[PDB]
Design an enzyme around this catalytic site. Sequence first.
Site, PDB file in Angstrom:
ATOM      1  N   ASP A 264      46.780  34.797  32.889  1.00  0.00           N
ATOM      2  CA  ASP A 264      46.607  34.514  31.462  1.00  0.00           C
ATOM      3  C   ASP A 264      47.391  35.526  30.638  1.00  0.00           C
ATOM      4  O   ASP A 264      47.350  36.718  30.913  1.00  0.00           O
ATOM      5  CB  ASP A 264      45.132  34.564  31.093  1.00  0.00           C
ATOM      6  CG  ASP A 264      44.268  33.412  31.608  1.00  0.00           C
ATOM      7  OD1 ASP A 264      44.747  32.457  32.092  1.00  0.00           O
ATOM      8  OD2 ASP A 264      43.029  33.464  31.346  1.00  0.00           O
TER       9      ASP A 264
ATOM     10  N   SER B 214      47.318  32.234  39.278  1.00  0.00           N
ATOM     11  CA  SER B 214      47.856  32.190  37.933  1.00  0.00           C
ATOM     12  C   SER B 214      47.512  33.480  37.179  1.00  0.00           C
ATOM     13  O   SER B 214      46.734  34.288  37.653  1.00  0.00           O
ATOM     14  CB  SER B 214      47.370  30.949  37.200  1.00  0.00           C
ATOM     15  OG  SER B 214      45.995  31.052  36.920  1.00  0.00           O
TER      16      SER B 214
ATOM     17  N   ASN C 153      47.242  30.264  30.117  1.00  0.00           N
ATOM     18  CA  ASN C 153      47.320  30.242  31.579  1.00  0.00           C
ATOM     19  C   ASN C 153      48.637  29.692  32.106  1.00  0.00           C
ATOM     20  O   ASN C 153      49.022  28.576  31.736  1.00  0.00           O
ATOM     21  CB  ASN C 153      46.116  29.429  32.109  1.00  0.00           C
ATOM     22  CG  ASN C 153      45.989  29.585  33.605  1.00  0.00           C
ATOM     23  OD1 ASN C 153      46.462  28.774  34.390  1.00  0.00           O
ATOM     24  ND2 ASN C 153      45.409  30.677  34.023  1.00  0.00           N
TER      25      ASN C 153
ATOM     26  N   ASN D 236      44.231  35.590  37.497  1.00  0.00           N
ATOM     27  CA  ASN D 236      43.150  34.680  37.824  1.00  0.00           C
ATOM     28  C   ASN D 236      43.044  34.522  39.356  1.00  0.00           C
ATOM     29  O   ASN D 236      43.996  34.765  40.116  1.00  0.00           O
ATOM     30  CB  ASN D 236      43.394  33.319  37.204  1.00  0.00           C
ATOM     31  CG  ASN D 236      43.620  33.425  35.718  1.00  0.00           C
ATOM     32  OD1 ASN D 236      42.848  34.084  35.042  1.00  0.00           O
ATOM     33  ND2 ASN D 236      44.623  32.782  35.188  1.00  0.00           N
TER      34      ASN D 236
ATOM     35  N   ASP E 207      43.071  31.904  41.250  1.00  0.00           N
ATOM     36  CA  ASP E 207      43.971  30.952  41.864  1.00  0.00           C
ATOM     37  C   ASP E 207      45.403  31.451  41.934  1.00  0.00           C
ATOM     38  O   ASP E 207      46.265  30.673  42.353  1.00  0.00           O
ATOM     39  CB  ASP E 207      43.867  29.598  41.136  1.00  0.00           C
ATOM     40  CG  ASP E 207      44.448  29.562  39.730  1.00  0.00           C
ATOM     41  OD1 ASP E 207      44.853  30.677  39.213  1.00  0.00           O
ATOM     42  OD2 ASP E 207      44.451  28.460  39.109  1.00  0.00           O
TER      43      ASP E 207
ATOM     44  N   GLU F 288      39.118  37.137  24.039  1.00  0.00           N
ATOM     45  CA  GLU F 288      40.090  36.862  25.089  1.00  0.00           C
ATOM     46  C   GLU F 288      40.969  38.091  25.307  1.00  0.00           C
ATOM     47  O   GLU F 288      41.266  38.421  26.473  1.00  0.00           O
ATOM     48  CB  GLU F 288      40.943  35.656  24.722  1.00  0.00           C
ATOM     49  CG  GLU F 288      40.189  34.347  24.802  1.00  0.00           C
ATOM     50  CD  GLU F 288      39.886  33.875  26.236  1.00  0.00           C
ATOM     51  OE1 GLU F 288      40.323  34.535  27.188  1.00  0.00           O
ATOM     52  OE2 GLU F 288      39.098  32.902  26.365  1.00  0.00           O
TER      53      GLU F 288
END
Length: 129
Positions: free
Chosen positions: A52, A50, A59, A46, A48, A35
């Site tokens: 991380d 958002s 998120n 991301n 959308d 990750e």
Amino acid sequence: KVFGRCELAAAMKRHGLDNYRGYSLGNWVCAAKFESNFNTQATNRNTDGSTDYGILQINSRWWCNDGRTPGSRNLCNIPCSALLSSDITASVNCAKKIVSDGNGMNAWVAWRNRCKGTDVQAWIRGCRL
């Protein structure tokens, strides 16, 4: 902070992630590796809108407040910046929440694609834990 592998394993084990929701420590170390590359400061946008955050790429859509994810939740009740600290307490506490809320570690796409179905306890081999 960029953790060493055994360094992170030991910290995760202290905050109670070994075998949390049945996931052995190696799963958590593997997830962190893929990750974030063990980097607490990692951030990734991301599709959308958002983002991380941190060593376990948590998120802003659900888990933390970053002030720019309109309509999102903050289920860990923290600013997303808290997830970038050298102290992994907030990330671990929030990850416990995430892994408990239905899909287990499948919430972490890198875990699903690169750790699940592999020899994950290799990630703690050699560590004095």
